[PDB]
């Protein structure tokens, strides 16, 4: 029977990897990585996280089945981290998931469960995995303009014009912050206008909050999400702990369902629990327990925020340096967007030809859409990348 | 939108878990003399070693780690493990393995039907219903003898067609405790090859029946006979890491080409559902399995659990014998595994819990691991008073 199976395409993160490894050049650089790496090219385990694991190893006495939709400590801590004081426990349903991707997949299953004729609007461009999951589910996908290739900023007028076509019951996927892959983000004022269009259309917003803490700060990064949450009755939020907690492989995510009333909340919470049951019964415990422990233990929460802040500031300085280098070389402020972008990613706006030419002549690797990871940069690699960009005529 | 969500039916077994001189005999979790589900010695040592050795938590393998895949393949199939034709996928527990098994099969056969034992783990049917798969049932439990109705099973299975899937419990049949002998297994292999039905084996209690190797005997027999077979394994109960969510799906194929196809489709399945599988439990398992000292202590502890439960069954049988003045309840000593169904009707079961404080699943399924010297005679007497 298994012979009838249609061949499925590989990730692609590995094809780029195999090519990079095969390159015999001593000065080759990899800006295609999708995770944070420090100065030494390593992805460390955050201090507070290692502290939580030592703590868990000494206090945990059992590993019996726990909470179906997650542990209360985790659900509450995550809700407070994302929504702050605006958290309305009475109308908020929460579900621990297998990473942010699991939260996204579940959000989609939940929405389709409530609205079979669901259509989803995604940004142009967006995290490729969004479309993949949606295509796999058979969901109708619609695109809304977002990245302005020329200014490398947000084409807001276009975004607004396209979103205006959304009908009641449709879902609009928004990146809460640090837009992957572009790095171009909405201002709080633009968020406010988006809220108006959403109220008008009656479209359900799904916020992908995977980088809270890498933009302008923990609270700052959740600002857009909190505005949407307070002005829109029903809101779906799929959060990730992979990057901001540095526990990628542990698979710790969270799905928040903001409902108009408690009756609906019980309905949503029950359906979410049912969704976990029919997929894998219970969600992973380890990562979630690390998170709730860090968040509930003052000493740890403190050290964690301090390490995240150091990380954010470090990347922000890398941006400033690159932008300055490019300013000095270009004799213009065209590349200023690099210092305006937020997150660990940025789309340079180079064409595939320019991308290939950069690799061949300078040994610098990056995603085919010209997306680079700022964390993979440093004092020694910045001058090289800058010169490369100018030389290939970007 | 969300206001249109219809209410869902709760999990009956896990419902009692919430409801609980109370005596918990419900959820299939191993418990010790003091009513505690402990962390196995080797598992604890493994976690301690992991804390010292892990330097990063970056994304790892989409299909799981090679170490985990290999160790698990060896634990299950032993020397019958043909890597060139075996695709392995780390999953979110055994339940995740089952779901992923059904998705893989449906992709290869949009019109597949699934044959399940009468009765079977309720969660088997709930998932199939959710997915919208046609479910047929085959006779298995003999309510009279409390054993297996093998004649009925053979009859019903012979009616299966190629492309269909037959779900079998590798050992320690949940919820009955009634198991097939190796001769009956060989007989089943004949039917499977004659009909061309794809076997899906749920292996959740390897080590709780007659032993690690012995509990895999039937699975190894089907794997050597049938060219294509799926195995959904759980590390929740035999490693005592229930909440970690670790298990794996093994896809045995006739050739390397099909193996490549299956492997790719399985990786794709994880990617579209939750991206990467959880690392913590899988790492604990491979660490135990690949470290001689740890594997040895683990096998010893698992054997102790096994022997202990077996002792309990005999105690319960004896106690009941004295009180009933008969041996009707003899079946309790012959059943193998964590569970055993008595026979008490729904009303009797309910009366028992509402006054005696002893909770057992509605179909009279009891977790023998929940008993001990003190509670056994109490239970025995309680069933006598509830009569029939
Ligand atoms: C990382 C990421 C996710 C989810 O990460 P998980 O590893 O599944 O926790 C979701 N959306 C975006 C945009 C991301 O960058
Ligand atoms: C335990 C069990 C499983 C798997 O449970 P997980 O906690 O998901 O590992 C599957 N089937 C049966 C019959 C079981 O008893
Ligand atoms: O009690 C059981 O049958 C095994 C434990 C279990 C029950 C329901 C969902 C997952 C695991």
Angstrom CA distances, A18 to A375, B220, B261, B280, stand at: 21, 37, 21, 27
Tokens (6 digits) for B306: 């096994």
- Token pair belonging to B137: 């049932």
Residue nearest to atom 4 of ligand 3 (CA): B28
Q: Please give the backbone phi and psi of residue A166, each rounded to the nearest 5 degrees, phi first.
A: -70, 140
Read off the DSSP letter of residue B146: T
CA atoms within 13 A on the CB side of B351: 12
Tokens of A180: 């992957």
Which residues of chain B are within 8 Å of residue A109 when distances are taken between CB atoms? none
Task: Please tell me chain B's helix, strand, coil percentages from 3-state DSSP, rounded to the nearest 5.
Answer: 50, 15, 35
In chain A, what residues touch B245 (CB-CB under 8 Å)? 280-285
- Kindly state whether B161 is in contact with chain A, defined as any CB-CB distance less than 8 angstroms: no
d(CA A122, CA A173): 5
Whole-number Å distance between alpha carbons of A188 and A196 = 13
Burial grade of B53 (CB within 10 A; 0-12, 13-18, 19 or more)? exposed
Q: Which atom of ligand 1 is nearest to the CA of B274?
A: 8
Do the annotations mark residue A34 as ligand-binding? Answer: yes
**Rounded to an integer, what distance in angstroms lies between the CA atom of residue B86 and that of residue B262?**
9
Three-state DSSP at A208 gives strand
With a CB cutoff of 8 Å and minimum separation 6, the contacts of A220 are: none
Q: Do B37 and A286 touch (CB under 8 A)?
A: no
Angle of CA points A76, A78, A81, to nearest 5°: 110
Question: With an 8 Å Cβ cutoff, is B60 touching chain A?
Answer: yes
Asked whether A125 and A367 are in contact (CB, 8 A), the reply is: no
CATH 3.90.1150.10 boundaries in chain B: 11-38+307-387
How many of the other CB atoms lie within 10 Å of CB of B385? 12
Q: What is chain B's length?
A: 388
Q: What is the CA radius of gyration of chain A?
A: 21
Selected from 3.40.640.10, 3.10.290.10, 3.40.50.1110, 3.30.1330.80, the CATH number assigned to the domain covering A45-312 reads 3.40.640.10
Q: Which helix (H) or strand (E) holds B145?
A: none
Does residue A127 have a known ligand-binding role? Answer: yes
**B262/A5 CB distance under 8 A:** yes
Peptide bond into B119 cis (omega under 30): yes
B234 touches ligand 2 (CB under 6 Å): yes
List CB contacts (< 8 A) between A260 and chain B.
Answer: 2-3
Quote the tokens at residue A66. 């726990």
Instruction: Identify the H or E element spanning B264.
Output: helix B256-273
Burial class of residue B311, CB neighbours in 10 A (0-12, 13-18, 19+): exposed
> Which ligand 1 atom sits closest to the C-alpha of A99?
9
Tokens of A186: 């909405």
DSSP A333: S
Helix axes A298-330, A286-296, angle to 10 degrees: 100
- Contact at 8 Å (CB) between A139 and A108? yes
CB of A343 sitting under 6 A from ligand 1 = no
Tell whether B155 is within 8 A of chain A (Cβ): no
Of B270, B288, B290, give the one whose Cα is nearest residue B59.
B270
Report helix, strand or coil for B93: helix
Index of the ligand 2 atom closest to the CA of residue B234? 9
Separate counts of helices (H) and strands (E) for chain A: 14, 13
Contact predicate B274/A98, CB 8 Å: yes
Ligand 1 atom 14: the closest Cα is on which residue?
A210
Cα distances (angstroms) measured from residue A94 to each of A67, A165, A182, A317, B278:
12, 30, 29, 36, 20
Compute the 3-state secondary structure of chain A and give helix, strand, coil in percent, each to the nearest 5: 50, 15, 35
CB contact at 8 A, A312 and A217: yes
Residue span(s) of chain B under CATH 3.40.640.10 come to: 39-306
Quote the tokens at residue B205.
């209690």
| Whether residue B237 lies in the annotated active site | yes
| DSSP notation for B313-347 | HHHHHHHHHHHHTS-GGGHHHH--SSEEE----HH
Q: List Cα–Cα distances, A145 to A126, A162, A173, A199, B273, in angstroms.
A: 10, 7, 13, 20, 27
Pick from A231, A226, A247, A240: which is nearest to A343 by CA? A240
CA distance A118 to chain B (A): 10
Give A138's contacts (C-beta < 8 A, 6+ positions apart): none
Give the CA radius of gyration of chain B.
21
Give yes or no for a contact between A125 and A181, defined as CB atoms under 8 angstroms apart.
Answer: yes
Q: Which residues of A are known to be catalytic?
A: 127, 208, 210, 243
Starting at the earlier edge strand, list the strands of the sheet with B247-252.
Answer: B86-91, B247-252, B229-234, B198-203, B165-169, B114-118, B135-139
Reduced to 3 states (helix: H, G, I; strand: E, B; else coil), residue B232 is: strand
Q: Report DSSP state, residue A282.
A: S
- Residue found under tokens 């169904």: B341
Residue A183 near ligand 1, beta carbon < 6 Å: no
**Nearest chain A residue (CA) to B165:** A1
Q: Which CATH number fits domain B11-38+307-387: 3.90.1150.10, 3.30.420.10, 3.30.420.40, 3.40.640.10?
A: 3.90.1150.10
Q: Which residue has the tokens 């298995």?
A: B140
What is the SS3 assignment for A6? coil
DSSP structure class, residue B361:
B
Q: Within chain B, how many helices (H) and strands (E) appear?
A: 14, 13
- Domain boundaries for CATH 3.90.1150.10 within chain A: 11-44+313-393
Topology of domain A11-44+313-393 in CATH is 3.90.1150
Burial letters for A308-341: b for 16+ Cβ neighbours within 10 Å, e otherwise?
A: beebbeebbebbebbbbbbbeeeeeeebbbbbeb
Chain B residues touching A97 at Cβ < 8 A: 274
What's the fold here for domain B39-306?
3.40.640
* Strands A364-365, A29-30: pairing kind: parallel
Give A90's contacts (C-beta < 8 A, 6+ positions apart).
A262, A265
Q: Chain B, 253-292: which have a CB under 8 Å from a chain A CB?
A: 253-254, 258, 261-262, 264-265, 267-268, 271-281
Q: Which residues of B fall within a CB distance of 8 Å from A257?
A: 2
Do A212 and A222 form a contact (C-beta atoms < 8 A)? yes
- Tell which atom from ligand 1 comes closest to the C-alpha of A103: 8
Q: Experimental technique used?
A: X-ray
Contact present, A37 and A243 (Cβ < 8 Å): no
Pocket lining: B121 vs ligand 2, CB cutoff 6 Å: yes
CB of A59 less than 8 A from some CB of B: no
How close A267 gets to chain B, by Cα (Å)?
A: 6
Residue A81 dihedral angles phi and psi, to the nearest 5°: -65, -40
- Does the beta-carbon distance from B279 to A250 stay under 8 Å? yes
Nearest to A78 by CA among A338, A367, A296, A341: A296
Distance between CA atoms of residues A297 and B51, nearest Å: 20
Edge-first strand order for the sheet with A141-145 is: A92-98, A252-258, A235-240, A204-209, A171-175, A120-124, A141-145
B30 C-beta closer than 6 A to ligand 2 = no
Of B3, B262, B275, the CB nearest to A264: B3
Strands (E), B131-172: 135-139, 141-142, 147-148, 165-169
Query: CB-based contact (8 Å) between B228 and chain A?
Result: yes
DSSP character for A68?
T
Token pair for residue B48?
Answer: 């301690």
Query: Smallest Cβ distance to B48: which of A49, A57, A204?
Result: A57
Annotated resolution, angstroms: 2.3
CA–centroid distance, residue B368 to ligand 2 (Å): 17
Q: Which atom of ligand 2 is nearest to the CA of B246?
A: 9
- Tell me how close the Cα of A198 comes to any Cα of chain B, in angstroms: 14
Q: Does the distance separating the beta carbons of B126 and A277 come in below 8 Å?
A: yes
Distance between CA atoms of B156 and A277, rounded to whole angstroms?
30
CA B337, distance to chain mean position in Å, is 10
Strand locations in chain A, DSSP E? 29-30, 92-98, 120-124, 141-145, 147-148, 153-154, 171-175, 204-209, 235-240, 252-258, 345-347, 364-365, 371-373
CB-based contact, A117 to chain B, within 8 Å: no
d(CA A327, CA A334): 8
Asked if A105 and B272 touch (Cβ cutoff 8 Å), the reply is: yes
Residue B298 in contact with ligand 2 by CB distance below 6 A:
no
The torsion angle over the Cα atoms of residues A65, A68, A73 and A74, rounded to 10 degrees, is 110
| Ligand 1 proximity of A100 Cβ (cutoff 6 Å) | yes
Residue indicated by tokens 């030389």: A391
Q: For residue A269, which phi and psi values (nearest 5 degrees)?
A: -60, -40
Cα B273 from chain centroid (whole Å): 23
Whether B80 contacts B224, CB under 8 Å: yes
């Amino acid at each position: 029977m298994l012979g009838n199976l249609k061949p499925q395409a590989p990730d692609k993160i590995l094809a780029l990897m195999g090519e990079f490894r095969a390159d015999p050049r001593q000065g080759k650089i990899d800006l295609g990585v999708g995770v944070y790496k420090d100065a030494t090219g390593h992805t460390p385990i955050m201090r507070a996280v290692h502290a939580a694991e030592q703590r868990m190893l000494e206090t945990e006495t059992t590993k019996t089945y726990a909470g179906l939709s997650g542990e209360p400590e985790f659900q509450k801590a995550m809700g407070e981290l994302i929504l702050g004081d605006g958290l309305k426990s009475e109308t908020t349903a929460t579900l621990a998931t297998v990473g942010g991707t699991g939260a996204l997949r579940q959000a989609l299953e939940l929405a389709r469960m409530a609205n079979p004729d669901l259509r989803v609007f995604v940004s142009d461009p967006t995290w490729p995995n969004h479309v993949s999951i949606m295509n796999f589910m058979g969901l109708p996908v619609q695109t809304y303009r977002y990245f302005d290739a020329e200014t490398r900023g947000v084409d807001f007028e276009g975004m607004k014009a396209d979103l205006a076509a959304a009908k009641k019951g449709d879902m609009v996927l928004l990146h809460g912050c640090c837009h992957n892959p572009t790095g171009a983000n909405l201002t709080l004022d633009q968020w406010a206008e988006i809220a108006s269009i959403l109220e008008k259309t009656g479209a359900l917003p799904l916020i992908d909050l995977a980088y809270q803490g890498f933009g302008d700060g923990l609270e700052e990064d959740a600002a857009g999400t909190r505005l949407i949450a307070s002005r829109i009755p029903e809101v779906l939020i799929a959060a990730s702990c992979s990057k901001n907690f540095g526990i990628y492989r542990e698979r710790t995510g969270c799905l928040l369902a903001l409902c108009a009333d408690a009756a609906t909340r019980e309905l949503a919470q029950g359906a979410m629990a049912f969704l976990n049951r029919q997929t894998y019964s219970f969600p992973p415990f380890h990562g979630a327990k690390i998170v709730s422990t860090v968040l509930t233990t003052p000493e740890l929460r403190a050290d964690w925020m301090a390490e995240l802040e150091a990380v954010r500031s470090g990347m922000l300085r890398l941006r400033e340096q690159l932008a300055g280098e490019l300013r000095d070389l270009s004799g213009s402020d065209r590349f200023g967007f690099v210092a305006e972008h937020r997150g660990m990613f940025s789309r340079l706006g180079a064409t595939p030809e320019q991308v290939k030419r950069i690799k061949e002549e300078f040994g610098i690797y990056m995603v085919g859409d010209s997306r680079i990871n700022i964390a993979g940069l440093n004092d020694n690699t910045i001058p090289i990348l800058a010169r490369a960009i100018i030389e290939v005529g970007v």
